[PDB]
Design a protein around this ligand. Structure first.
Ligand SMILES: [Ba+2]
Ligand SMILES: [Ba+2]
Ligand SMILES: [Ba+2]
Length: 205
């Protein structure tokens, strides 16, 4: 027997939990659809829709969006409370920590999109910092592609070498749109160029 399903108070907080995740997912999906590379991938079937400098600017704008979002989240609890004696609820805090948690991730994700690509080393320092040392190469790649880098194998290896040299599955921000990452992975294996083909299957995997 399950009694919590008939409790209006338990529900309202679960609902805010859902609103939170919905908004987080939209923020993530829109960002990716915006910035992601257009299949088929190659130096042809290109240039990239945006230069990396512009992606950085975009990142900057998302920070202001993220800020407004944060405020919306801090506001949700007030929508379910007529009684605002809020030292509790052991449930309210759960909601607050949840909002705070999602914002942090977004923040990292964006901070990461805004990172410069001047040195492969400096980029590694911040990539591992911001993803908590995520060893996944597909994630790494999607991120880099999202950053706006063109399909320059020389530059990719330039970037990758530093990463590789220093490095259950953690999908980072893609926790929120597994499918887009999956498609990205597929498109990447479908590259016609033999070098790329070899770079993908042997160097990245
Ligand atoms: Ba600028
Ligand atoms: Ba109220
Ligand atoms: Ba290694």
């Amino acid at each position: 027997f399950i009694l919590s399903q008939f409790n209006r108070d338990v529900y309202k907080w679960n609902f805010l939990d859902k609103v939170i995740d919905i908004m987080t997912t939209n923020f993530v999906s829109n960002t990716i659809r915006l910035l992601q590379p257009v299949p088929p991938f190659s130096l042809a079937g290109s240039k990239r829709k945006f230069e990396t400098r512009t992606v950085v600017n975009i990142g900057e704008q998302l920070l202001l969006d993220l800020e407004l979002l944060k405020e919306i989240f801090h506001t949700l609890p007030e929508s379910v409370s007529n009684d605002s004696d809020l030292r509790e609820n052991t449930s309210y805090k759960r909601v607050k920590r949840h909002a705070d948690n999602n914002i942090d991730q977004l923040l990292k994700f964006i901070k990461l999109l805004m990172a410069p690509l001047d040195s492969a080393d400096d980029y590694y320092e911040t990539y591992s910092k911001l993803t908590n040392n995520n060893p996944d190469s597909a994630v790494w790649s999607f991120v880099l592609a999202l950053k706006g880098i063109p399909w320059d194998l020389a530059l990719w290896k330039k970037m990758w070498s530093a990463y590789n040299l220093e490095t259950n599955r953690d999908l980072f921000i893609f926790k929120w749109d597994k499918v887009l990452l999956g498609q990205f992975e597929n498109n990447l294996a479908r590259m016609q160029d033999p070098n790329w083909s070899k770079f993908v299957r042997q160097d990245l995997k």
